[PDB]
Enzyme design. Sequence first.
Site: not given
Length: 428
Positions: A363, A141
């Site tokens: 998450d 990311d």
Amino acid sequence: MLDNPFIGAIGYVNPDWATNVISQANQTADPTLAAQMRKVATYSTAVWLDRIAAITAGRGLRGHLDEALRQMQQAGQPVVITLVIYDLPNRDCSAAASNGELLVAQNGLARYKAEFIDPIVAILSDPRYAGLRIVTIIEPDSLPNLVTNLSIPACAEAQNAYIEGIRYAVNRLRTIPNVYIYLDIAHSGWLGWDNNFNGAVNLYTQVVQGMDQGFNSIDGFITNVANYTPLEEPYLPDPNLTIAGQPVRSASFYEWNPYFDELDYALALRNAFIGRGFPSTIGMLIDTSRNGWGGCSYGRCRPTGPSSDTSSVNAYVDGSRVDRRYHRGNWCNQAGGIGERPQAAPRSGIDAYVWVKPPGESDGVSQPGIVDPDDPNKKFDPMCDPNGQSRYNSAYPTGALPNAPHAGRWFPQQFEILVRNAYPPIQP
Ligand SMILES: [Ca+2]
Ligand SMILES: [Ca+2]
Ligand SMILES: [Ca+2]
């Protein structure tokens, strides 16, 4: 240096993760499910270094490496351990809020180098670890945001810190002969579209060219880290297939992206990079921790063939796709299943399937108002709201499971779902 560090080595088994799995198995009433969980605990997962504290917290980096040495002695063959390097300043810039502790505007790059990379490199350089293969996954990311998200200030402001930080990380890690380096390159549902794909190839070529060893500075790339995108969409093998006058890639789920799965995407990237000058010795990894899509969720079970409904492209695709998320951007706490087990060289050009995200770890927390006593940097993200809509397309729900703890913490409800939905199914 080996052509593929996963060939001829067994994967490191993280005892701290396995302990959580076995603890849940012991509290699971169904004997079959419990036995499946015990089997899951025998598989290899990556160790995440997601903050400076992670270097020494618990058994710490040295502790995991010492444990890898023990497993290597015990097995009588090399162990390959995977580490995720994940602490760039302005980390995860496209989120409204970063869980990352370092900020570009507050000496973030300098601290990343001195307090994160440097001590990691010092530990990995210890001659005691020379017999291991150490795989480093570099900064999930990060770079893909510079392809698609520069409209977001946090990303645009972080560009040069990402570039210089990743170069610094790779340059220092390359001084260690048993370290194998793979750059994260998102997944097909992020960079598959033509403009994104070409933009990524351009960007990563520039980033790597500027490293000390140029195209020899890395061993390859990894896709699907902590995501759920399938390796293969067996019943949608041709993105140009016409259904009701239109190609299937035009379906709402895909929005004209011709990459429906990670094998198509990873192999296409690898070929593109070789075309730009990377040596054919590069290989790809794919994170298969949570992309199996067995069982049933989101109102569907796994398809067993192409849909019989050829009346519209949306009906056909939605009835044929293995990825049954409501929207491809739904990344948080999904009711998916464990995918292919870690394995070396499953396809030409693919070095290994790996479990980078450890199955069972959250998450993100599912609601605001709850602070993690061990990390006040961790912040609620609306993509994890079970009652909310996607920020990428508000017409769709997030699909996020309820009752999730903060990111990285054990999420027993999702773990049970991930095991039940494993594909191939877990065998006790
Ligand atoms: Ca190689
Ligand atoms: Ca230092
Ligand atoms: Ca395919």
